[PDB]
RNA sequence: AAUUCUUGGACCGGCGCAAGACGGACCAGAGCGAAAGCAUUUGCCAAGAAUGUUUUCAUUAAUCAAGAACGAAAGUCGGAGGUUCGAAGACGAUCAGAUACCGUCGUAGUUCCGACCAUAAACGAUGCCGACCGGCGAUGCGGCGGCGUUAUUCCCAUGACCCGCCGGGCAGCUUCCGGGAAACCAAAGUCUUUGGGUUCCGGGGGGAGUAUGGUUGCAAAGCUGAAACUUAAAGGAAUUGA
């Protein structure tokens, strides 16, 4: 929620989610296999094209 | 199993300092360090152990930089024990590079807004002022002190366990002048601890020899020098 | 909203999940709080409240699950707010507000037992709070910037502790808790505080009426611990008559007269009676004997001084002040203690009273047995610096003195052999933030005592050092080298001859003294009879062994 | 193989859209429920066993003709809906014949709301309440005690493991408890040494759950239920052959 898509497909590329979720239910009964299994996108903004030509450097 | 081709631990460590989650990028390059690639030191190793260590220093953390460098040497014997030499000197040169920046901005930026502070003294240090003193000292040890008790932990550290006896080692030498030099720089507790190692290392030395140990005799260098 | 129908029937049904497993703890001080900031109409919203806020508050300090933990600084200044906003609606509100009939409403609730015990729930809030500041004091690094963060809160307490101070509806006889709790924060406030508000001396600086209210403070502890201590002669408990005048003893310390706090501490003859009260009690007692022998000390009276500072530093075993010492022996009864252990700022200084145990005996040592150490031994004394003596000449490489011991002694040395300023500026270089001279409530006065102390104590040099072959003396220069008022050098050697007796004759209308001291070698066939007394000591002795 | 679909571009591949069913793997001789039965998330509503108890009432209890609540599937009437599958039926094959098995279609139905019907190998083919009589290892819930491991790194304290004990539950293994025609059953035992309490119900096989009367249902049908006549066996467990 807190940051844009950029830096969320950067965190979905280790599994840092993952790794995150793995060590908050430690606690409760520890877990092993903690992956993001699946992300679909639903709705999109409107189509700029200076957005993406810095998401291609 | 975590890693086949271990060039590939460098990747993932590198792609959590994207994130920059510091804690599982040391992980996995820990978990590599400890397991079947054992293979002596392939040139992927230097940059592995370099990374190790640069996070080691970061996150402040001795016994992590112990156990680094003791997987290494283990898997780097004498068959070339050039990359360990220069492992250990980076890691020592981090650790005293980033403190002398740690004294330089908590001993300017903060004690320059102490030169403007309450020195016209309030109650809450009158009350303070029958124990401790100056106020430089009572700031820089919250932001400086830290770093200092880990230079002096890696100190010991590199000539406690990784140099005993150990005839391959001129570089146990050099540490220890480089932290003798270190001490009439900071504090000075950290000394008596280390002539009383120089000492209990030496009572180490002349006794036995039963590994290839410093045969402590004519042999100029060794020895002497 | 509805005329506490709906209010005090809420209020409970939100004050029924105090400390139930799985209340959360944390989304209750919410509900507590939308029954003042959700209640805004009169006896409604703003008479009532006091029972509302009761239970506000009592339930923010259990935020904490733990008694042995310390509160976060968050809750703790939201207690420090929250306790204030009740003190300042009932002040201007002069009614008893969980009961005794006022109107008809919203108060007069005396169909729940009685308004005392619930009425004197206002202090237990404040007293609760006092207890829980030491927490946050004990558990926190104390060379750390957050220490001082901290102790400028020691101020906003102070202020509460004043306010309900104030609130003198008691029924001295039940209020005395909160005078126990007001002298307990205000009885080792320094010289600083305590002579700072008389002395910048009274004309046109300081007796004003709107400048003479801080001055009340320091004769506050003679206004409240008089009635602590002589209504609870008649009264039950033993803490609040035992706490409240060793308070009265360690606060007439450290700035005022060692005869007005002797009859005190005497007067409670402590010393063989408190045997059988509790180690938080027997702590703050060894804290004032230790104040009494510093203001002796710093008073120059330098041998009760040392008779009183004797098995403390004699037992190893001297953090009865400090935090915890040593190891192993219970570590089930070494966690009880890390709770009894004093806050760091009350701590007086330890190589503060390591330099007055050993120059206390540095005053009493190097002058007494200087008499019968000329071969003459039969007055030894084998508890003093000797303890260190023996062993810090017993090494070979010895240079320049860096800890208290060694920078005691290595100046103690060259005022034996009388060397007056050799004796003098090795105790007055880098001890002064070593914690000798600064680290005392008073500058250049303590060194005044103590170099004064060395300047009578470096006359009385000659008398038993120097007057080997001394055949003619000399007395106006005597006084002028060492730079004293001539009399207060007089005096003492006029002592020396009443008290040491020195085989020398005295003819002060003159100003000189021939001395003709020869037993120079008449002493040493007599260091032979040093024995010959042994042999006759025991031959009145033999006898008795045999028969 | 054929009936069916397809150069008015089927089948295969991509991006979307809608629809109505259904909750895989995790899923177990695991759990809950009076039985039928019950599985994605989250919220709301009332219920419930077991455990814990130095709380409370003081025999208020067990089983039950009459009477009553729920009752899979199919089935009937009314409204909404119709993806899949599919009694009827339309064919295509095989076959001596196929009115079936196999294959392409396919109405009722399958799904939801509201009225009925009240039956199943509705099974543990085994009524309920209570007491007594071997051992072992696990398991699900609650409690209790104890080296040690791991997370909260500060570990008080909770959670995940480990070792035992207590009580309720689903089951298992084992034995000359004992029983039984045996198969087998810690209950199907404590039965000629026959008696703890109580409800329902069986009397050789057919005829027959048929006829008739009554009653319930719109219908289908449900509950109660004989006789004449025929017959020497029908049947249960286990053995040896084919």
């Given at each position: 929620?807190?940051?844009?898509?950029?830096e969320?497909v950067?965190?979905?590329?280790?599994?840092?989610?993952?790794?995150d979720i793995?060590?908050?239910?430690?606690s409760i009964?520890?877990?092993?296999?903690v992956?993001?299994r699946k992300v679909?996108?639903?709705?999109k903004?409107?189509?700029?094209?200076?957005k993406?030509?810095?998401?291609?450097? | 199993?975590?890693?086949?081709?271990?060039?590939?631990?460098?990747?993932?460590?590198?792609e959590?300092?994207?994130v920059?989650?510091?804690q599982p990028?040391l992980?996995?390059?820990?978990?590599?360090?400890k397991?079947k690639?054992?293979r002596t030191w392939?040139?992927?190793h230097?940059?592995?152990?370099?990374?190790?260590?640069?996070?080691?220093?970061?996150?402040?953390?001795?016994?992590?930089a112990?156990?680094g460098?003791?997987?290494?040497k283990?898997?780097?014997?004498?068959?070339?024990?050039?990359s360990l030499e220069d492992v250990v000197?980076?890691?020592?040169?981090?650790?005293?590079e980033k403190?002398?920046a740690?004294?330089?901005?908590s001993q300017?930026?903060?004690?320059?807004?102490?030169?403007?502070?309450?020195?016209?003294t309030?109650?809450s240090?009158?009350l303070?002022?029958?124990?401790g003193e100056d106020?430089?000292?009572?700031?820089?040890?919250?932001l400086?002190?830290?770093?200092?008790?880990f230079?002096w932990?890696?100190?010991?550290?590199?000539l406690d366990?990784?140099?005993n006896?150990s005839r391959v080692?001129?570089?146990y030498?050099?540490?220890?002048?480089?932290?003798?030099?270190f001490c009439?720089?900071?504090?000075?507790?950290?000394?008596?601890?280390?002539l009383?190692?120089?000492l209990?290392?030496?009572?180490?030395?002349?006794?036995?020899h039963?590994?290839?140990?410093?045969?402590?005799?004519?042999n100029?260098?060794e020895?002497q020098? | 909203?509805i005329?506490?129908?709906?209010?005090?029937?809420?209020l409970?049904?939100i004050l029924?999940?105090?400390g139930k497993?799985?209340?959360?703890?944390?989304?209750?001080?919410?509900?507590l709080?939308?029954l003042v900031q959700?209640?805004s109409?009169?006896?409604l919203?703003?008479?009532?409240?006091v029972?509302?806020?009761?239970?506000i508050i009592?339930?923010?300090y259990?935020?904490?699950?733990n008694?042995?933990?310390?509160?976060?600084?968050e809750?703790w200044?939201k207690c420090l707010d929250?306790?204030n906003?009740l003190?300042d609606i009932?002040?201007?509100?002069?009614?008893?507000?969980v009961?005794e009939?006022?109107?008809?409403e919203?108060?007069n609730?005396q169909?729940?037992?009685?308004?005392?015990?619930?009425?004197?729930?206002?202090?237990t809030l404040?007293?609760?709070?006092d207890?829980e500041?030491?927490?946050?004091?004990?558990?926190?690094?104390?060379?750390?910037?957050?220490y001082?963060e901290?102790?400028?809160?020691?101020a906003?307490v102070?202020a509460?502790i004043?306010?309900v101070?104030?609130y003198?509806?008691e029924?001295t006889?039940?209020?005395?808790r909160?005078?126990?709790?007001?002298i307990?924060?205000?009885?080792?406030?320094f010289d600083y505080?305590a002579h700072?508000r008389?002395?910048?001396?009274?004309?046109?600086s300081?007796?004003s009426?709107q400048?003479?209210?801080?001055?009340?403070?320091?004769?506050?502890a003679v206004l409240?611990?008089?009635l602590?201590?002589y209504?609870?002669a008649?009264?039950?408990?033993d803490?609040?008559?035992?706490?409240?005048?060793?308070?009265?003893i360690?606060?007439?310390?450290?700035?005022?007269?060692?005869?007005?706090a002797?009859?005190?501490?005497?007067?409670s003859h402590?010393?063989?009676?408190?045997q059988?009260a509790?180690p938080?009690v027997?702590?703050l007692?060894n804290?004032?004997?230790?104040?009494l022998?510093i203001?002796?000390?710093?008073q120059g009276?330098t041998?009760?001084?040392?008779?009183?500072l004797?098995?403390?530093?004699?037992?190893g075993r001297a953090?009865?002040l400090?935090?915890?010492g040593?190891?192993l022996?219970?570590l089930?009864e070494r966690?009880?203690?890390?709770?009894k252990?004093?806050?760091r700022?009350?701590?007086?200084?330890?190589?503060?009273?390591?330099?007055?145990?050993?120059?206390?005996?540095?005053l009493?040592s190097?002058?007494?047995l200087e008499?019968?150490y000329?071969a003459?031994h039969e007055s030894?004394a084998?508890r003093?610096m000797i303890?260190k003596q023996?062993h810090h000449?017993?090494?070979?490489?010895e240079r320049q003195?860096?800890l208290?011991?060694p920078?005691?002694m290595?100046?103690?040395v060259v005022?034996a052999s009388?060397?007056?300023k050799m004796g003098?500026?090795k105790?007055?270089?880098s001890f002064?933030?070593?914690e000798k001279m600064?680290g005392?409530?008073?500058?250049?006065?303590?060194?005044?005592?103590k170099?004064?102390?060395?300047?009578?104590?470096?006359?009385?040099?000659?008398?038993?050092?120097?007057?080997?072959f001394?055949?003619?003396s000399v007395?106006?220069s005597?006084s002028?080298?060492?730079?004293s008022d001539?009399?207060?050098?007089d005096?003492?050697?006029?002592?020396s001859?009443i008290?040491?007796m020195?085989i020398?004759?005295?003819?002060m209308a003159?100003?000189?003294?021939?001395?003709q001291?020869?037993?120079?070698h008449?002493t040493?066939?007599?260091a032979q009879q040093?024995?010959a007394?042994?042999?006759?000591?025991?031959?009145?002795?033999?006898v008795?062994?045999?028969?």
């Amino acid at each position: 929620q807190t940051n844009d898509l950029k830096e969320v497909v950067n965190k979905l590329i280790p599994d840092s989610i993952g790794k995150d979720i793995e060590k908050a239910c430690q606690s409760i009964y520890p877990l092993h296999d903690v992956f993001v299994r699946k992300v679909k996108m639903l709705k999109k903004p409107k189509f700029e094209l200076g957005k993406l030509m810095e998401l291609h450097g | 199993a975590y890693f086949q081709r271990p060039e590939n631990a460098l990747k993932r460590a590198n792609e959590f300092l994207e994130v920059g989650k510091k804690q599982p990028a040391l992980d996995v390059l820990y978990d590599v360090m400890k397991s079947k690639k054992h293979r002596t030191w392939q040139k992927i190793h230097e940059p592995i152990m370099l990374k190790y260590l640069e996070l080691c220093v970061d996150l402040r953390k001795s016994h992590l930089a112990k156990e680094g460098l003791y997987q290494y040497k283990n898997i780097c014997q004498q068959v070339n024990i050039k990359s360990l030499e220069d492992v250990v000197r980076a890691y020592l040169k981090l650790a005293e590079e980033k403190t002398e920046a740690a004294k330089e901005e908590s001993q300017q930026m903060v004690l320059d807004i102490e030169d403007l502070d309450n020195i016209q003294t309030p109650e809450s240090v009158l009350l303070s002022a029958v124990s401790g003193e100056d106020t430089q000292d009572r700031t820089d040890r919250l932001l400086l002190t830290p770093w200092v008790k880990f230079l002096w932990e890696s100190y010991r550290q590199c000539l406690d366990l990784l140099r005993n006896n150990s005839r391959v080692e001129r570089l146990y030498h050099d540490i220890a002048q480089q932290a003798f030099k270190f001490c009439l720089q900071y504090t000075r507790k950290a000394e008596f601890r280390k002539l009383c190692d120089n000492l209990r290392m030496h009572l180490s030395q002349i006794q036995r020899h039963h590994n290839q140990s410093t045969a402590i005799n004519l042999n100029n260098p060794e020895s002497q020098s | 909203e509805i005329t506490h129908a709906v209010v005090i029937k809420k209020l409970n049904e939100i004050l029924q999940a105090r400390g139930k497993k799985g209340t959360d703890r944390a989304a209750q001080i919410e509900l507590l709080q939308l029954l003042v900031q959700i209640a805004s109409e009169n006896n409604l919203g703003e008479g009532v409240i006091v029972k509302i806020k009761f239970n506000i508050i009592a339930s923010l300090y259990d935020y904490n699950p733990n008694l042995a933990t310390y509160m976060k600084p968050e809750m703790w200044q939201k207690c420090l707010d929250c306790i204030n906003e009740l003190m300042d609606i009932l002040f201007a509100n002069p009614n008893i507000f969980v009961g005794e009939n006022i109107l008809e409403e919203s108060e007069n609730l005396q169909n729940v037992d009685q308004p005392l015990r619930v009425r004197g729930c206002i202090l237990t809030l404040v007293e609760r709070m006092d207890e829980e500041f030491t927490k946050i004091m004990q558990n926190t690094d104390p060379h750390s910037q957050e220490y001082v963060e901290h102790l400028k809160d020691e101020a906003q307490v102070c202020a509460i502790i004043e306010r309900v101070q104030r609130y003198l509806e008691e029924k001295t006889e039940e209020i005395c808790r909160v005078y126990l709790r007001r002298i307990l924060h205000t009885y080792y406030k320094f010289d600083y505080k305590a002579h700072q508000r008389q002395l910048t001396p009274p004309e046109g600086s300081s007796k004003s009426e709107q400048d003479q209210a801080e001055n009340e403070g320091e004769d506050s502890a003679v206004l409240m611990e008089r009635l602590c201590k002589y209504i609870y002669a008649k009264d039950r408990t033993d803490r609040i008559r035992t706490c409240a005048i060793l308070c009265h003893i360690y606060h007439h310390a450290l700035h005022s007269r060692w005869y007005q706090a002797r009859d005190l501490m005497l007067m409670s003859h402590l010393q063989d009676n408190i045997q059988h009260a509790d180690p938080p009690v027997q702590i703050l007692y060894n804290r004032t004997m230790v104040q009494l022998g510093i203001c002796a000390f710093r008073q120059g009276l330098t041998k009760d001084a040392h008779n009183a500072l004797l098995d403390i530093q004699s037992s190893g075993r001297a953090k009865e002040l400090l935090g915890q010492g040593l190891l192993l022996r219970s570590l089930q009864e070494r966690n009880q203690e890390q709770e009894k252990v004093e806050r760091r700022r009350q701590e007086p200084f330890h190589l503060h009273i390591n330099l007055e145990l050993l120059e206390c005996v540095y005053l009493v040592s190097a002058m007494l047995l200087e008499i019968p150490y000329m071969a003459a031994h039969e007055s030894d004394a084998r508890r003093r610096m000797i303890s260190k003596q023996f062993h810090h000449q017993l090494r070979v490489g010895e240079r320049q003195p860096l800890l208290g011991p060694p920078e005691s002694m290595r100046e103690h040395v060259v005022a034996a052999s009388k060397a007056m300023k050799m004796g003098d500026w090795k105790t007055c270089h880098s001890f002064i933030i070593n914690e000798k001279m600064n680290g005392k409530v008073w500058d250049l006065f303590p060194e005044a005592d103590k170099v004064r102390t060395m300047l009578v104590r470096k006359i009385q040099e000659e008398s038993l050092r120097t007057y080997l072959f001394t055949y003619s003396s000399v007395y106006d220069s005597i006084s002028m080298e060492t730079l004293s008022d001539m009399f207060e050098l007089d005096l003492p050697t006029v002592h020396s001859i009443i008290s040491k007796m020195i085989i020398n004759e005295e003819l002060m209308a003159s100003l000189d003294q021939p001395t003709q001291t020869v037993v120079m070698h008449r002493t040493e066939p007599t260091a032979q009879q040093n024995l010959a007394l042994q042999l006759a000591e025991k031959l009145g002795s033999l006898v008795e062994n045999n028969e």
